[PDB]
Structures are given as C-alpha cells and as structure tokens.
Design a protein around this ligand. Structure first.
Ligand SMILES: CCNC(=O)CSc1nnc(C(C)C)o1
Ligand SMILES: [Mg+2]
Lengths: 151, 151
C-alpha cells in the first residue's frame, strides 16, 4: 500500500476502535467526517484541536460530563479539526421518533453536505451513520467499516 | 505585544484554567512544558496529539479511568505534543515521602532537562512545580501563573 492508503486505514481503525468502546459503554458520540463539501463554518463553532487521530483521543473527547463531549467532533484531512462543534438540527419527519438531538444533528449536517457522520446512542449504545439525509441505524462493526471504506 | 507574546499568553491562560479546574476536583495531572532542552525521546513514548492547546483538551486528557490520563502530557510551545508519556523517576530524597509516581516523574524529567512540570495531586488537589531537580509544593493560583509568565 501507498503512504496515503496506509494512513487512511490507520484512521479507519482508530475510529472503529473508539466507536466500539463507546458503544459498549453507551457513551453518546457524534463524529462528522468532512468530504468534498467544506465545513469550515461548523468547524469554527467548536474548540480547535487540529490533532492527530487516535482511538485514545476520540474516547477522551466524548467522556460524559467533560468540556469537550457536548457537540460534534469534525474530522478533516485525516485530523481532528475541532470538538464540541455545532451541527444543524434536521427537521425531517422521517427520523425514528425515539431518537434525540444527537441523531437529528447528524442527519441535519448530512442534508447540506456530502459528509459522513457516525452517532453512538447514549440510550442503547447503538451505532448509526448519517449520509445524504438518511440515517442508517443499528450497524454492526462490519457494516460501519464497510461504510468508512466505501466513503 | 507580538503575535508570539500573545500566543504565549493564551497558552498560559489555558494551562492555568485547566490546572485550577483539576486542582478543585482532585484530578491528578502531570504536565511538562518543554523549554530549550528537547524532549523528543519522551514525547515519542506517548500517544501523538500535536494538538492546539485549550483548557478543555487538557482537562479531558486527565479525566480518571480514560485512555490518556496515565502518564505525562508534554507541551511544545503552543501545542500538546503527546499524552500518556513516560518520564524518568527521580530518586531525590527531597521528594515528600507521601507523594506518588506523578511527582517523582516530574522531578525526574526536571533533573535532565530545563523543562517546567506542573503536578496536581489526586490526594489533596495541591499544585506543585518541578524545575531543575527541585519540587515546589502547595502553590497558589497566583504563584503558578507568575512562575509560568517568568518561564
Ligand atoms: C534529554 C532529552 N533529550 C531528547 O529527548 C532528545 S530527542 C531527539 N533528538 N534528536 C532526535 C532525532 C530522532 C532527530 O531525537
Ligand atoms: Mg510552601
């Protein structure tokens, strides 16, 4: 593999490891990966990090009752750009009714960007992905990895 | 002031805010600020972050029972270079016998570098600084800030 390919796989592995840890403990999480549509306006609402990705840092960001856990992490160019970012809340009437603002925020950003957002539910530990205005719920580990690799 | 001086002031403000927060909550912390003696060998033992400084990130790093809380954070200028770093343990007899590994690690790195290390005790919330092989304990918020500004 090239250097770029190895870096992308390392980042996918760090993400999946962090998501698995948080799903097991039912830690709510919101992680948006910027793609072709620029998201600087939303990145600027959070706490700047421009940090290297690691499963450890992702976990430490989302610990409940900490400064950085409320809001979205936004990743860009293989780094964590910022944490505690605002995302717009979807008004879609087709989101499962039992879901709260975390999932609505993920769907909302997915309606106006080509980004991929991962959500961990604090109620169930379920893992979902928002893209193109739709929420893909109750994902297995393999399903999330396939989505990240496809993206 | 110059941009360099303003950046230094912002970093000092972020450090002091985080240390004060952690001291009040008895959150143990070990934070080494690299100076003119390079500490790459110790930075490379931890988890790379290369992240912009913020009080929020510093606090999140040291939350107990998290991946990044054990070991030292090492700062380079205005960045958090790495977390969970190893530091050498001092054998100095002038370390209070009741103090644990964080304080001995801080004095240890201060014996082989010109760095300044801040320690928060998880037992008492007391704040101490290690520099040039000496540990100065029970610092007030004002004393810590003055030491950082003088550094
Ligand atoms: C007393 C602590 N001193 C250090 O940690 C030096 S680190 C260091 N210096 N050069 C290198 C090469 C790998 C470029 O790495
Ligand atoms: Mg005294």
């Amino acid at each position: 593999p090239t250097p770029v390919e190895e870096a992308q796989q390392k980042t996918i592995e760090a993400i999946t490891k962090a998501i698995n840890y948080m799903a097991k403990r039912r830690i709510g999480a919101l992680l948006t990966i910027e793609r072709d549509t620029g998201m600087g306006d939303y990145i600027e609402t959070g706490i700047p990090l421009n940090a290297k990705v690691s499963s450890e840092l992702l976990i430490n960001i989302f610990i409940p009752n900490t400064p950085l856990h409320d809001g979205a992490v936004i990743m860009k160019n293989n780094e964590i750009a910022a944490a505690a970012c605002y995302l717009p809340l979807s008004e879609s009437p087709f989101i499962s009714k039992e879901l709260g603002t975390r999932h609505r925020a993920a769907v909302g950003i997915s309606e106006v960007t080509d980004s991929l957002t991962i959500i961990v539910s604090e109620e169930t530990g379920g893992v979902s992905v928002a893209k193109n205005g739709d929420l893909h719920r109750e994902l297995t580990e393999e399903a999330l990895k396939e989505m990240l690799e496809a993206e």
